[PDB]
Amino acid sequence: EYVVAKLDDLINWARRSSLWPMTFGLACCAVEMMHMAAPRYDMDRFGVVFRASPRQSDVMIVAGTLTNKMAPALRKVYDQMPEPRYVVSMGSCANGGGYYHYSYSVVRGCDRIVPVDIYVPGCPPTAEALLYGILQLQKKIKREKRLRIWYR
Amino acid sequence: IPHGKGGRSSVSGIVATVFGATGFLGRYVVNHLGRMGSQVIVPHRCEPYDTMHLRPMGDLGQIIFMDWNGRDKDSIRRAVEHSSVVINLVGREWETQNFDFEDVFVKIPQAIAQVSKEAGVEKFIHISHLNADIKSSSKYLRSKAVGEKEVRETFPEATIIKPAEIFGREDRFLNYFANIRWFGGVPLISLGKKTVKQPVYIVDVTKGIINAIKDPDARGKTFAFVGPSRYLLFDLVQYVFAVAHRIGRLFEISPFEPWTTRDKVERIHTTDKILPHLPGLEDLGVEATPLELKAIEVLRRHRTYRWLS
Amino acid sequence: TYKYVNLREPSMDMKSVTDRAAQTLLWTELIRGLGMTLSYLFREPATINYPFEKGPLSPRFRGEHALRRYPSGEERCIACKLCEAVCPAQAITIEAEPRADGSRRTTRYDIDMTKCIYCGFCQEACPVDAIVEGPNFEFSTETHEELLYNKEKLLNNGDKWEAEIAANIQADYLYR
Amino acid sequence: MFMINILMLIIPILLAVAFLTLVERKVLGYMQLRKGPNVVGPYGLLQPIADAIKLFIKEPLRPATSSASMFILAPIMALGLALTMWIPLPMPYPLINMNLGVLFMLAMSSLAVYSILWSGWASNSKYALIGALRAVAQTISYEVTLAIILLSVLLMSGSFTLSTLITTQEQMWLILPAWPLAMMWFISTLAETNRAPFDLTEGESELVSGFNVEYAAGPFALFFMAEYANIIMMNIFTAILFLGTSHNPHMPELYTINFTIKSLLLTMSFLWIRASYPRFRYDQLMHLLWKNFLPLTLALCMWHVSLPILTSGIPPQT
Amino acid sequence: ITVDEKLDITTITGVPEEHIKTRKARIFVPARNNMQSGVNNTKKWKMEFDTRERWEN
Amino acid sequence: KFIWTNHKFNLSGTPQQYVPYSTTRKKIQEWVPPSTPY
Numbered sequence A: 001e002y003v004v005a006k007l008d009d010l011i012n013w014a015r016r017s018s019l020w021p022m023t024f025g026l027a028c029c030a031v032e033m034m035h036m037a038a039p040r041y042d043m044d045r046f047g048v049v050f051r052a053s054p055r056q057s058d059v060m061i062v063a064g065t066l067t068n069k070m071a072p073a074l075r076k077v078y079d080q081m082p083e084p085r086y087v088v089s090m091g092s093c094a095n096g097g098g099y100y101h102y103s104y105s106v107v108r109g110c111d112r113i114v115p116v117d118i119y120v121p122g123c124p125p126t127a128e129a130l131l132y133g134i135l136q137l138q139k140k141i142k143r144e145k146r147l148r149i150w151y152r
Numbered sequence B: 001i002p003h004g005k006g007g008r009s010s011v012s013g014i015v016a017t018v019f020g021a022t023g024f025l026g027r028y029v030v031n032h033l034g035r036m037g038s039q040v041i042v043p044h045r046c047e048p049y050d051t052m053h054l055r056p057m058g059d060l061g062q063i064i065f066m067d068w069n070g071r072d073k074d075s076i077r078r079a080v081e082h083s084s085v086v087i088n089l090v091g092r093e094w095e096t097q098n099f100d101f102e103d104v105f106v107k108i109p110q111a112i113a114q115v116s117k118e119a120g121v122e123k124f125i126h127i128s129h130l131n132a133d134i135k136s137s138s139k140y141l142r143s144k145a146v147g148e149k150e151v152r153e154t155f156p157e158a159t160i161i162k163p164a165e166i167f168g169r170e171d172r173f174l175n176y177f178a179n180i181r182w183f184g185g186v187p188l189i190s191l192g193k194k195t196v197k198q199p200v201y202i203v204d205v206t207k208g209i210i211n212a213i214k215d216p217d218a219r220g221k222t223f224a225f226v227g228p229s230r231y232l233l234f235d236l237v238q239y240v241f242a243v244a245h246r247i248g249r250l251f252e253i254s255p256f257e258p259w260t261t262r263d264k265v266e267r268i269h270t271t272d273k274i275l276p277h278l279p280g281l282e283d284l285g286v287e288a289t290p291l292e293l294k295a296i297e298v299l300r301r302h303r304t305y306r307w308l309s
Numbered sequence C: 001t002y003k004y005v006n007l008r009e010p011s012m013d014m015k016s017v018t019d020r021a022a023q024t025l026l027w028t029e030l031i032r033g034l035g036m037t038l039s040y041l042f043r044e045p046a047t048i049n050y051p052f053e054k055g056p057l058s059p060r061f062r063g064e065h066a067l068r069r070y071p072s073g074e075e076r077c078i079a080c081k082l083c084e085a086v087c088p089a090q091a092i093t094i095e096a097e098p099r100a101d102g103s104r105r106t107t108r109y110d111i112d113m114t115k116c117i118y119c120g121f122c123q124e125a126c127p128v129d130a131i132v133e134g135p136n137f138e139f140s141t142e143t144h145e146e147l148l149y150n151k152e153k154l155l156n157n158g159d160k161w162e163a164e165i166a167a168n169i170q171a172d173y174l175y176r
Numbered sequence D: 001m002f003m004i005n006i007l008m009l010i011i012p013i014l015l016a017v018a019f020l021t022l023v024e025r026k027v028l029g030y031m032q033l034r035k036g037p038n039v040v041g042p043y044g045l046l047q048p049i050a051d052a053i054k055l056f057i058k059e060p061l062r063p064a065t066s067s068a069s070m071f072i073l074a075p076i077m078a079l080g081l082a083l084t085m086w087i088p089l090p091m092p093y094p095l096i097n098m099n100l101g102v103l104f105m106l107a108m109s110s111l112a113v114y115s116i117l118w119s120g121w122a123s124n125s126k127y128a129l130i131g132a133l134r135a136v137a138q139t140i141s142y143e144v145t146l147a148i149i150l151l152s153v154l155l156m157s158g159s160f161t162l163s164t165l166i167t168t169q170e171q172m173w174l175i176l177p178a179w180p181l182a183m184m185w186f187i188s189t190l191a192e193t194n195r196a197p198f199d200l201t202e203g204e205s206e207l208v209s210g211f212n213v214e215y216a217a218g219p220f221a222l223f224f225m226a227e228y229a230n231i232i233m234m235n236i237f238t239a240i241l242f243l244g245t246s247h248n249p250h251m252p253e254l255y256t257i258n259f260t261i262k263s264l265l266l267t268m269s270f271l272w273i274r275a276s277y278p279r280f281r282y283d284q285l286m287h288l289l290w291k292n293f294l295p296l297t298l299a300l301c302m303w304h305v306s307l308p309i310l311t312s313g314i315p316p317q318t
Numbered sequence E: 001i002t003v004d005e006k007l008d009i010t011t012i013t014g015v016p017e018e019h020i021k022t023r024k025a026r027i028f029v030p031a032r033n034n035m036q037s038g039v040n041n042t043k044k045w046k047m048e049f050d051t052r053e054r055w056e057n
Numbered sequence F: 001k002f003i004w005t006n007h008k009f010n011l012s013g014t015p016q017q018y019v020p021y022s023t024t025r026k027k028i029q030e031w032v033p034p035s036t037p038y
């Protein structure tokens, strides 16, 4: 009866406390990602170990600008990820495209291509409003897998 | 009032609402309203994250989500108050361990046939099935033909729809087969007689609605959905092995979501082709689609390359 | 001028060549650094312990937007249509129309927060000195239906802290 | 209760191989100048209970293109010959007493690489296909460097069993006398088990990810728990075959105490390297074995053969 | 050298799509905005096309 | 004055996510038909 809703203080605390983010370097924004894993603001060892292969991940991250020829590549990679997946865009160019938003060869927005969750806003987000964009996503698991099996 | 061209980021003046619209069918309709422009208010029951795979469907500020239960007479009254057309796909397979299933085709489709009628919707719509007949069959197939009777009372204008057995991409109809790696294929019931029904391809049904969605001039007047040619054989169950070359679940697993040794086995062989006099399709057309050509796509198995069919 | 690097010759005498054969075969190098220069772990780590501690900045920083107002408020913006016309990205959108008394003000003012490239071109063209890039990285909401701003989102977002802003410009305005 | 002496072994070790993964990035943390997993612990010591549980919840895909019959019997190994090899290993009292058992390791050191060749082939094409082929090729050429330099010392101790090998290292820490060899006993186990400076098997640089690439969270805990069940064993061996402790027929307990404060120092060596050195570019990788490591290992064998005979030294065994 | 004289009225096809025949361009001399007297905005014959609907979003 | 008392946050749905709107007066002012008489 009540055991389920106490069980989700385990499984919904496990998936939020270990993340294996992929990253996409593409454009300027990649360097202000690196400095999140450099020792100043130290990304790993605060619970999130940095890049792994495409298969083993949970949260992919889009930096950079997405042209036409990169779209056929992304949408494929987003699939293969396992279940408990999310997409956290960052930078002013995954939100509606920085500038270049009027260009010919830039997709406009990268929400169009995938179901994106959290956003961050500015050429490079300051390597700070990154982590405070994740401490949104570790607080964006308040969800319960109870009340699907156990209501309907 | 419709503006511009129908590409995306356009208007085309219709709002909507689509109840259900998570599982196989509803996801595949809204995707045709996230194109020609709309305001598609899709509510949903329990699922916070299972609805995301939908969101890159309408452009921006088109589709919008709410939360509802459906036995509360308010939850259906808070949304619809602003709407033009509202269709209804709601309902499912097996009796739930919670919902007793009896009136969920009776009370629910009426519970949303509450103030919707009152509040001034229009072109309200509902679903039927080609095989549901109020004579005695079939325990699930019954209670569905009650809605055609019981619910039609309300909202004299419906254009309630009557399609066949459908085969989609992720659909469970033709996919119950080929999942049958098992002690062996045993037809229902070990007879090659009355297979098969009218297997229309899921595009044409979901292109029917939006063709009646502003039709005009179909309201109250119900239609039924032609299959392709023509009836079909036993070979359909052989055809599966001819080419195949032989939401909100859980964290670990689901206790019971079975093959249902119940109506399920007998719902598939009930056949009963029925009245032609319904208009019912080319009039709402123009669509009809075959089987032989469109059944490779949805069927891909452990060869993944050879076909030569 | 010049320099020449990696131009040298081995000495070739038996006082040396032991020193290079006491190296290959005994590993006397290659334990020099990474037997050591690695450890050398005994230094204090450098980490800004994030949810609490935070790092440095400067009064000229750029970030979330605002619209000030004087003492008793005038909505300092006069709608002179400039911060709109120097904008590289073309985020800004402005529609004036004469307010009731006859002093002009705005109606729609919308900074898109995806397109804005964070120049510092809209802080520096406003002659009446209204629009100002705030120093707060509060951001990151979950729906792109949102970040587009209207007017009456901005003012609050710029009256939520004016104790932050009104004390930066009076450090910085003496330089420019 | 002999069955409860076993199951008291398999279980209490799966905690080390678990909590190594934590001390993985603390020690390798302060080489970088930072702290290690911290926020969750409080000290971090609570991290690995959360990590063991994310995988088996996370959905285990199989490639549509695979042969499922091999995609099981292979990993159903990477966890046997890792947990069987532990059996006859004195600390001080081994669970089994095998007469000639030292030889029995090479039996189980040789039979694991025939679980690599399955998996990488079991699945599919060229990242795990020819990519699991040529990590076979290096793994078998670092045995001949091995069995010899294991066989050398055994001239210097008399037999194949391990109860003698505590007796002979009494007051002589067997690393004096053959210190030339001991080096090569180290670079081997580090080259054979696919660790830092010769890293190629598991990919990072030379390829994407070697041999792990296909397994999703489901099976890939086993390998990631198998590959660390070899590394803490060869290194829990070296120190019974070189740095000996002093048995005590009275306080057996003080044997192991001083024994894990050695084997646990020693191990923290494959972590103390990995921060440091780069990779070899597979040519140079074998090309440095025949030419370079090997000629000595033969030559020394012609030496430890004669040294007993030429001193009337011949060790007291059969 | 292959000089090969001939005459075929130069045209080019396929690069745009349906906007070849649908529209009508226009060639006109700009008229001088009259709020000011500066005569230098003249002097080049530009061209600009027909205008089609802009709607509201 | 003209500044707040306590505070707010950046929240994901609070319920209030603010979800912006349009700030302007109408446009073309459609015609009204005449009333009841012929």
Ligand SMILES: CCCCCCCCCCCCCCCCCC(=O)OC[C@H](COP(=O)(O)OCCN)OC(=O)CCCCCCCCCCCCCCCCC
Pocket (backbone or CB within 6 Å): D073, D076, D097, D098, D099, D100, D101, D104
């Ligand atoms: C995938 C799921 C399906 C597979 C499930 C089953 C898998 C089994 C795999 C077997 C792998 C381990 C087999 C290795 C055999 C090693 C035996 C050995 O070396 O024992 C040493 C010992 C020597 O005797 P000694 O010490 O000299 O004299 C003692 C005097 N008191 O010897 C002795 O003490 C006497 C020997 C007693 C043991 C009886 C013989 C056991 C070996 C049978 C193995 C059968 C092969 C199974 C398949 C192997 C495939 C790798």
Ligand SMILES: NC(=O)c1ccc[n+]([C@@H]2O[C@H](COP(=O)([O-])OP(=O)(O)OC[C@H]3O[C@@H](n4cnc5c(N)ncnc54)[C@H](OP(=O)(O)O)[C@@H]3O)[C@@H](O)[C@H]2O)c1
Pocket (backbone or CB within 6 Å): A152, B019, B020, B021, B022, B023, B024, B025, B026, B044, B045, B046, B047, B070, B089, B090, B091, B092, B093, B104, B108, B127, B128, B129, B163, B164, B165, B166, B247, B248
């Ligand atoms: N016309 C045909 O050919 C045909 C064929 C088979 C079945 N049907 C029936 O016609 C409709 C087609 O449904 P479908 O193809 O989309 O498959 P479906 O899986 O039944 O889709 C129904 C969606 O609504 C949900 N749902 C179930 N019961 C609900 C309830 N009381 N209230 C609100 N939501 C409920 C379901 O789970 P959630 O509650 O989590 O959303 C699901 O998300 C259904 O009623 C079906 O039983 C028709």
Ligand code: SF4
Pocket (backbone or CB within 6 Å): A027, A028, A029, A063, A064, A065, A091, A092, A093, A094, A098, A099, A122, A123, A124
């Ligand atoms: S906006 Fe972000 S992404 Fe686009 S260029 Fe500047 S940094 Fe690179």
Ligand code: SF4
Pocket (backbone or CB within 6 Å): C076, C077, C078, C079, C080, C081, C082, C083, C084, C125, C126, C127, C128, C129, C130, C131
């Ligand atoms: S701030 Fe300066 S620029 Fe922006 S509107 Fe008011 S006046 Fe025109």
Ligand code: SF4
Pocket (backbone or CB within 6 Å): C086, C087, C088, C089, C090, C091, C092, C115, C116, C117, C118, C119, C120, C121, C122, C123
């Ligand atoms: S901030 Fe940078 S981009 Fe946004 S408007 Fe002012 S200048 Fe143009």
